[PDB]
Write a protein that binds this ligand. Sequence first.
Ligand SMILES: [Li+]
Length: 470
Amino acid sequence: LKNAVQLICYPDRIGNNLKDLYTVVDTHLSEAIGGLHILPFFPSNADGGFSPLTHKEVDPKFGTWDDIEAFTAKYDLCVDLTVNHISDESPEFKDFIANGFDSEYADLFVHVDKFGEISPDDLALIHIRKEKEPFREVTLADGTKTRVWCTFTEQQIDLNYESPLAYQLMESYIGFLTSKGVNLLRLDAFGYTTKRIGTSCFLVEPEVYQILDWINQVALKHGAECLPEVHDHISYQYAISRRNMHPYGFALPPLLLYSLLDANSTYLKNWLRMCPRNMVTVLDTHDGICIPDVEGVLPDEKIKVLIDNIDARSAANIHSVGAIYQLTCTFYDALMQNDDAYIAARAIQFFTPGIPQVYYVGLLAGCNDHELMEQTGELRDINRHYYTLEEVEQDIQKPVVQRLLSLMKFRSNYPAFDGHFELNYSNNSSVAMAWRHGDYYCHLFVDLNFKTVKVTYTDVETGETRHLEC
Ligand SMILES: [Li+]
């Protein structure tokens, strides 16, 4: 897998289709990116393809499989394996309803009547997305009432991992996708899949790791890399690094938001000393910033400083089990549209060990739009605005976006990152990150209280060290 800036993007949000994205990606980002994580295409009733009827298909409006294949041929390809759940509209679920209890698929779906009568203590013990019980009374064709357990939307149905049919549905999905050339696959919400009474049912030790390893092994024979995603204390991300499945850099976005807010480099630098390896490093993402990803990394005093100095166009936060659970804003509006601060943030991300991943609304320095969110009624939709290609053109004609593009291209192009990372000494208000591969060497220095981003690099054609201000 190549060490170049990637791109998380939608099949339909930019352009009218996947090919339209290909036209723009070839026209620009051809030299800047080298990878592509495309949010799901396959037909879904809920969560933007997070609940597909099947991974074995591509929705027609978004595009055709061959267009996805063309992306696979040119760049790296990452797509979502919703290992936790499948659609109710999905045929295997439909067959189970038609056959009622007597279906091969039904054994694969989890049933809550199997657990006996759950205690109130055991009930409260469960890790909760929303404040209704994670259950689903199904209307069978038989005219009978049964209960399946699902974590997210009712249309999504959780598939338990005590039936090997779960692992086998997985393996067929992985087979199709890795054949289509997907370099990497992200295991969506892996922790939720383990379920036990008297247990949180999220990230349960060590079965969740065992389930992850089996999926990873099938992918490795497949040749597709695994990027399981979890929103929990970084220690779980470190465990994923030990597994060799790639960890996510969920801690760095709020860490950098604080560090830029207060002009404070200390916690960022400790994290850099000890960050997990094989990480893929985000700033702006298609979800919000689920705060528990920064806890421990940033003190509660500083998380409170950040959350307060947020409250002001800027973030909106919805919390179910916490005073703040998540905050939804475009990263640009998180930094109050200050483009020097945003450039420093992207540079720091790129010098962070791991594979940097820029988001589309981030790449076009997009400001959040309330109106798309209001019609949807979805929070995260302020970070998921639709782009037309001429909107694209005029937005890449912005100075901040062109600076960003210069930055993205250099990080993918430069030899030194392929070497070792050495973080340098600096004061508590600035940061110094260096890469040294062989003769090649590059060096990011950011002043956080002035937002100045100076990179010194050695270029073989010159044969001499050179200094530029990205
Ligand atoms: Li690996």
